[model samples]
Target: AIAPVITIDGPSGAGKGTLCKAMAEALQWHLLDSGAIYRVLALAALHHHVDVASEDALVPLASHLDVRFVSTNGNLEVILEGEDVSGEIRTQEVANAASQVAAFPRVREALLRRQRAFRELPGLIADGRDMGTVVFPDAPVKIFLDASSEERAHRRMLQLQVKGFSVNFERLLAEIKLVPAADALVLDSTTLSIEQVIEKALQYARQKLALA
Candidate 1:
């Protein structure tokens, strides 16, 4: 049988990344950073100067995307076209272009298998804006964590910087707008402290999976 999946779908800056990382480490499961995949595709398109708005133009590119995620000194480094693009794909320009390319249904469809291929091993922890609905519908433990745009915008900036990109705030918020869904749990993390949010989410997830 395919390994079970835990899908954590959420908007940008909704704490999905942190939570997924914690859960993956706690359970010793593989982690899938789905957003980065799209970001790499956008970065590739920009390097090749492919029109993001044209679905036909992007379909072939998506089909043959030469992106690789390599582990480097305990961090995931994204390699594209034989070069390390871990930092290049984190810019505001690539984020905007990724959002645009993501809108094309065919582009998403083309990347589905690539995204789903991350499921493996004892289990998998999938993180992205559409993990539950689009990518991993059979996910046994699904979570949708979100916060207000005002709260997430600042957090988004911090996240980019961690990836070695210091993008402007105004541009980041203007470029990426995400609306995500939930299944078993919908946690509004705007008012909760980081520890409290993770503790509650972990407890709930463990209980659901009978891991508690």
Candidate 2:
């Protein structure tokens, strides 16, 4: 692809959703929320009552999931088939199901092609757990942003509140040296503000793209 991809692979509470959007908005590029892909897959499976345990059952659904993220007039909408599931897919139930579904390697393999298609004209900021490793290994700029678990859980509670998404504090309290890619620049944001974290990532973006 002529267009470059900037990948941010990290844990949930490390502020990837906010950072990826900031990156895409600053560059006026496309964004890929791969976590949402898995989440929406679970949503679809839930809709169909597909046995979530069977990889065989999910592989077909994963390939033909009819999931798409469309950016219209600066707003991004997650559409499944012809309908909107952006809000519906964010439920705690879907998230729990997504975590379970994502654990299946074949299911991830089935959605691999769908995830990488977001590389568009200008660029793409990919947000996921494995983008730098399994999905976009060739991405010139990859960031593994992380923080201590306690620190992350703190931010996550605040993040959910700000997004008006409900979550149980018990689970928030409950939950990666996900080996960084050889080329990924790692940032530990335990002590950083969202602005401060983005500040460095934005600078890193310029540096990497300029070098690219």
Candidate 3:
């Protein structure tokens, strides 16, 4: 039997991380943070000193990416090449680098199979810019979460500041709009909390998938 998939796609700073986590918990399904995979790949490239814009160089690394995800003490630990990079991958720099790599069609193609493998026996909750349109076109539920660039940038700035990074809000907002996905359950997180997004997504998924 094919596992059910709920895809969440949107531009950056839409609060996808919290929404995906909550949805996965609510449904008791596996979660695939595809952006994290891209971030990991980008981190790999950074450590290896590979050029992010070079598809040919990134494709090989994407194909044979030595990465593993493990749960320790109820938290996910992403290990790459014997180094734990879970925290590192969450940085703004890594995320920006990841955004660059994700824009490459070849890089996305290379990671397609790996992302699909997240589908297990029960269900899968996927989060990424192209989860609904590209990775899981037939996903039972698709959500496109979004918000105004200024608001998203405000949230992002708070997030970065909490992590001790001073960022320029204007630049952050500009970057948020640059990356867009065509299909998704678009919501303005600037006015909605993570709980609200999860509730709406669950409601839509239940209706579309005929789930109780």
Candidate 4:
């Protein structure tokens, strides 16, 4: 039997990270950043010079991805093939590659089991694109946060700039809009601050999970 989990799915830069971190802290549950898993696979593919366009080429790699997450001083560090790739996988290039590889049906299917393995005894707060839709459909509390493409692009630009990258707004918006929908409560965070979004999500989650 699987443990209970609260899934928070959304587009990139939609404040899912902030909300998930807050909720995980509030509930004392483990947090899974599912995007990092994809990004790590993308990074490994790039390092191995694997062709992302070939779905057959990525399936085996995705199935046997050598990745691990370690906790250091309250922060989770992602390691791929024994090297620390916590920062390398966060680049916009790897993000775009991850998004590309994540579109392959077979690749996604291969990683499904590994992603679901994040659930533990107490609870888990899963964060990613399909956390609610494809991964945890029966999650007790699922929140899908969305924002205007312009707003999401702005957030992505800010994040990229802080990481020393120059990005195109329209391209970022177009990429972020390619995400799918969720079957949970949809919260618009376009005009809301981080605290307000966190508050709304937590309040709704409390109400929903209490009934579960």
Candidate 5:
């Protein structure tokens, strides 16, 4: 039997990353940032001048993509093609590109095995846009965190500035609404604390998984 997993799936800038990290720390579970795979694929497409809109071209790159996530300083260090890209790949451009490629069913399919390989003993905290919907349908706990476009944009602005990127609030809000996911818990972080959301989610999950 596979080890238990907690899936924290959601759109960009929805606090899933923070929640995932908190849960991973709380449970000492393995983590998977599936969107990073999409980002790495998107970055590769950009590096090779391949059109992100073309599924056929992206498929081959997705199949042979060389990406790795190493543990560093209590966080995952992303490496692409044997080089560190942990910081470079999280840019707004790459995120949008990732969502673009991620929207394609075929590309999502291509990354399935790679994402599933992260599952191991202890447990797993899978974070992405489709973890519960398409990736880990069998995960015992699934959450789809969300927030108002304006609020999510505010959070993104703060995040981008911390990473040295100029802020454009309107553009950021516009992007958050374009995501595609159907099977999600869809909690708006605009009004809920992370702790409150976590408690609520865990309550539902415990019931679902029959946790004592």
Candidate 6:
């Protein structure tokens, strides 16, 4: 039988990452940061000087993308071609390039398998905007986390600054969107009571999965 999965889909700085970490710890499940694959793709492409506009060139590269993620005591390590780019993958350039590569149907379709492959043994917390609506449609529990624009901007300021992304409110308040799963739990994480969000999520998930 396939191990069950819980999906937490949300925009950046929406607290999904924190929630996922909690759930992953409590459940002792694998964590799948679905967005990272795309970033890794873009980063790999840049490393190879692949033409971003050339679909034919990109599709072949995507088909053979070499990357692996290691979990060292819950801190994820992204390894690319024997080198680590976990930190490098988080830059605005890679984020924008991820958006660029994600636009091509062929490229995205090719990379979809990599994400699904993360669903090996044990369970997983799948995190990404499309994880619930698109990627993990059969996930036992799905969470759509979001916060007000004002709250999001504030959250971004803190997260980005810590990550060395220069705190600019204008950029922090940029954009967010996604198709929500029909029956997903939607959370407005304006502030922490991260404890409460974790409590509510675990309860719903336990009930949904019939876990005692």
> How many clashes in each structure?
0, 0, 4, 0, 0, 0
lDDT of each: 0.79, 0.83, 0.79, 0.81, 0.77, 0.81
**Model 6 stretches with alpha carbons more than 4 Å out:** 48-50, 70-74, 163-177
Per-residue accuracy of model 1 over 39-129 as CA lDDT, tens digit each: 9998888999899899999998998887655443346667788999877886788889999999998999888877787778888888887
lDDT of 5: 0.77
Q: What would the per-residue lDDT of candidate 2 be over residues 1-212, giving only the tens digit for each residue? A: 67889999887788887788777778878878887888889999999999899999999999888876665544568888789988888688899999888889899888897787778778888988889998888997999998788767777788688678767766887851166799998987787877898999999889978755
Give the number of the best model, judged by lDDT. 2
List where candidate 1 sits over 4 angstroms from the true fold: 45-61, 64-76, 79-84, 96-104, 157-182, 210-212
Candidate 4 or 2, higher TM-score = 2
For candidate 4, write residues 1-212 as lDDT tens digits.
26888888877778787777777777777778887888988898999999988899999898888776554334667878999888898787998999999899999898897778778878888888888778887887778888888878888899888788888888887877724444587788977877898888888877866645
Q: Order the numbered candidates by TM-score, best leading.
A: 6, 2, 4, 3, 1, 5
User: Least lDDT summed over 10 consecutive residues: which range in candidate 1?
Assistant: 68-77
Question: Which residue pairs overlap in candidate 5's backbone?
Answer: none
Q: How high is the lDDT of residue 75 in model 1?
A: 64
Q: Which parts of model 3 have CA positions greater than 4 angstroms off?
A: 44-61, 64-83, 91-106, 167-185, 210-212
> What would the TM-score be for candidate 4 when compared with the true structure?
0.73
Write the candidate numbers in order of decreasing lDDT: 2, 6, 4, 3, 1, 5
Q: lDDT by residue for model 3 over 90-166, one digit each (tens)?
A: 88899999999999998988999767877886888888877877778877667788777876788789878878888
Per-model TM values vs. the true structure: 0.71, 0.78, 0.72, 0.73, 0.70, 0.82
List candidate 5 stretches off by more than 4 Å. Answer: 42-76, 80-83, 91-107, 168-186, 199-212
